[PDB]
Design a protein around this ligand. Structure first.
Ligand code: 92G
Ligand code: 92G
Ligand code: YB
Ligand code: ZN
Length: 606
């Protein structure tokens, strides 16, 4: 069972389809309307069912044109409140009914961020976006909020007429709202069954530009041009992904560039990937995030984790595919560079969590744990590490990609656990079971800390990063004069980032070293978000007071948790900025994304 859902499990009943009809009210910061769920009984004599909700106001439940009895249970913290519905007529196995629930969301829905005009690029219109993963869909509409159930959907969304709605679905037309000529209805259809965490909505002053045969970029007008350039590799990435994963089944692959407060680098919403504007480096250097979101169209969206305990299936295989796309575009040495970078990231996470911490396990027990609190790079990189280790063990990339494609084919449109994956692994590689039995499965899947084996990594592109990092770490005062801008001349932006990543691992450095770095490399001028992030962390942890306003600024002017959370932690750990960190958080709290607010608050112990 899914310990994160309070709804009837899939073994009792299954939602087949959602029809959503709602209106977006910016003045009230509410979504209001009806969720019509087509539900199929999996049991004989079914007389009631339970749905997940969180901070939803229920007006009525209608079945067969009549109002029916329902009750809301006690709130169970982050899980929300179970909604039990008494069915008018007992259902047979496989019998389907339609249950139409009239509801309204709370302004504090953890699924939604409502932005005032002053929080947008254009400063004229408000903006709304959703983020349902893992378990926030219940904060938008009543549903079986579990990835074990996959449904198709249709929607009509009424918005002020000067604004545009988009969803994780194929755009199916727009018309004036016949109930209100100040409004427009946008229509949507998602014909491929999906888990409900992939339901998504944005409403705002959006413009679009075409960047490939099946891709429009959407954003506020101010970001469209930069976005179209930054993500121009999208179609070639899709073509490579199709070669590795099989047919792209989703029709459209559009991109939405969100305002700065979007909490993740991206979110793989079907037909409409959501991305952070911190990707806009000016040189396409952060495009691996697009590769990653594209790869989710197979691993995650087609083959889905059955519960959140098995989230590594989603993330590990997606990083694996992502690195193959990047490897095809830029070479195998680059795939290895990124892979080795990912091992370093895993080192950080384990060091930070503690090597006995339950959240360093590949498969976790999320019973009574808020998945938002458990989220980290561990399922990404430990997942990737396992697959890359298996790749090397089992005969190399070409062979392991054969498994990958077969795995996607096998489990498409289904939800699976680590058991299912392991069973199919053993089935596909039955001719190599002897090899497979040398894998320490208990350690890999269920033990905390670093993996029992480190894969083999090509070092070619990483050597120069390590060389320069070590020069700085081993430098004494009388050596600082030897550094100059020519040191970076043969480094790509990826290599500069990794140089900073390597050096940050040994932080603090002496304040004199860090001042010299700025003097010769002018890292303060770099706008690449990844590089700037690591540089500012390096400065704060090395106790450079001058970096305080820059770190505070980066932490608050964007909201990607990858950056914001460690920036606030570093600022709180520096005695000179500690009070500033806490105060700044308290001042920005109200206008932050609700999940980010909560997590930063936890991090700051406030
Ligand atoms: N065997 C060795 N691995 C490394 C290494 C480990 C992690 C990184 O991110 C980068 C390099 C240095 S020497
Ligand atoms: N392998 C691991 N997966 C997780 C995890 C699982 C589900 C989430 O929503 C967030 C994090 C933590 S450690
Ligand atoms: Yb010396
Ligand atoms: Zn992902």
């Amino acid at each position: 069972v899914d310990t994160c859902s309070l709804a009837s499990p899939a073994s009792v009943c299954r939602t087949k389809h959602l029809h959503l009809r709602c209106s977006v009210d910016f003045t009230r910061r509410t979504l209001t309307g009806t969720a019509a769920l087509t539900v199929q009984s999996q049991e004989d004599n079914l007389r009631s069912l339970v749905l997940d909700t969180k901070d939803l106001t229920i007006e009525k439940v209608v079945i067969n044109g009549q109002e029916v009895k329902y009750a809301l249970g006690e709130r169970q913290s982050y899980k929300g409140s179970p909604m039990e519905i008494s069915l008018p007529i007992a259902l047979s196995k496989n019998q389907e009914i339609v249950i139409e629930i009239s509801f309204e969301t709370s302004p504090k829905s953890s699924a939604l961020q409502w932005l005032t005009p002053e929080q947008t690029s254009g400063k004229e219109h408000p903006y709304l976006f959703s983020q349902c993963q893992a378990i926030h869909c219940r904060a938008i509409l009543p549903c079986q909020d579990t990835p074990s159930v996959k449904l198709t959907y249709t929607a009509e969304v009424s918005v002020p007429k000067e604004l545009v709605a988009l969803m994780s679905a194929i755009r199916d037309g727009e018309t004036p709202d016949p109930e209100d000529p100040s409004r427009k209805i946008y229509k949507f259809i998602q014909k491929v069954p999906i888990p409900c965490y992939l339901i998504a909505l944005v409403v705002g002053a959006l413009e679009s530009r075409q960047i490939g045969p099946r891709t429009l970029v959407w954003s506020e007008k101010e970001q469209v041009e930069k976005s179209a350039y930054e993500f121009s590799e999208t179609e070639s990435m899709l073509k490579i992904a199709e070669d590795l994963g099989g047919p792209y089944v989703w029709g459209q692959y559009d991109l939405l560039v969100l305002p700065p407060s979007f909490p993740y680098g991206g979110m793989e919403n079907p037909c409409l990937t959501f991305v952070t504007p911190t990707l806009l480096a000016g040189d396409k250097s952060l495009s691996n995030v697009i590769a990653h979101e594209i790869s989710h169209s197979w691993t995650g969206n087609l083959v889905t984790n059955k519960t959140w305990d098995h989230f590594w299936l989603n993330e590990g295989h997606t990083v694996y595919l992502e690195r193959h796309i990047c490897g095809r575009l830029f070479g195998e040495k680059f795939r290895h560079f990124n892979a080795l970078g990912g091992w370093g990231e895993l080192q950080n996470s384990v060091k930070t969590f503690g090597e006995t911490h339950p959240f360093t396990k590949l498969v976790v027990d999320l019973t009574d744990i808020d998945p938002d609190v458990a989220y980290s790079s561990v399922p990404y990189e430990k997942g990737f590490a396992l697959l890359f280790y298996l790749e090397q063990l089992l005969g190399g990339p070409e062979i392991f990609l054969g498994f990958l494609k077969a795995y996607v084919e096998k489990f498409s449109y289904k939800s699976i656990t680590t058991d299912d994956w392991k069973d199919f692994l053993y089935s596909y590689f039955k001719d190599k079971v002897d090899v497979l039995n040398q894998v320490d499965w208990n350690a890999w899947l269920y033990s905390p800390g670093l993996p029992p084996i480190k894969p083999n990594y090509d070092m070619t592109l990483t050597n120069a990063c390590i060389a320069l990092s070590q020069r700085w770490i081993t430098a004494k005062e009388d050596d600082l004069n030897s550094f100059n801008a020519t040191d970076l001349k043969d480094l790509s932006s990826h290599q500069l980032n990794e140089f900073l990543a390597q050096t940050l691992q040994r932080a603090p450095l002496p304040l004199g070293h860090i001042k010299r770095m700025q003097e010769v490399y002018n890292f303060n001028a770099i706008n690449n978000s990844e590089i700037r992030f690591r540089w500012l962390r390096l400065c704060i942890q090395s106790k450079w007071e001058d970096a305080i306003p820059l770190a505070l600024k980066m932490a608050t002017e964007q909201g990607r948790m990858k950056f914001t959370r460690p920036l606030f932690k570093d600022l709180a750990a520096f005695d000179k900025s500690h009070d500033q960190a806490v105060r700044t958080y308290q001042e920005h709290k109200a206008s932050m994304h609700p999940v980010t607010a909560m997590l930063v608050g936890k991090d700051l112990k406030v």
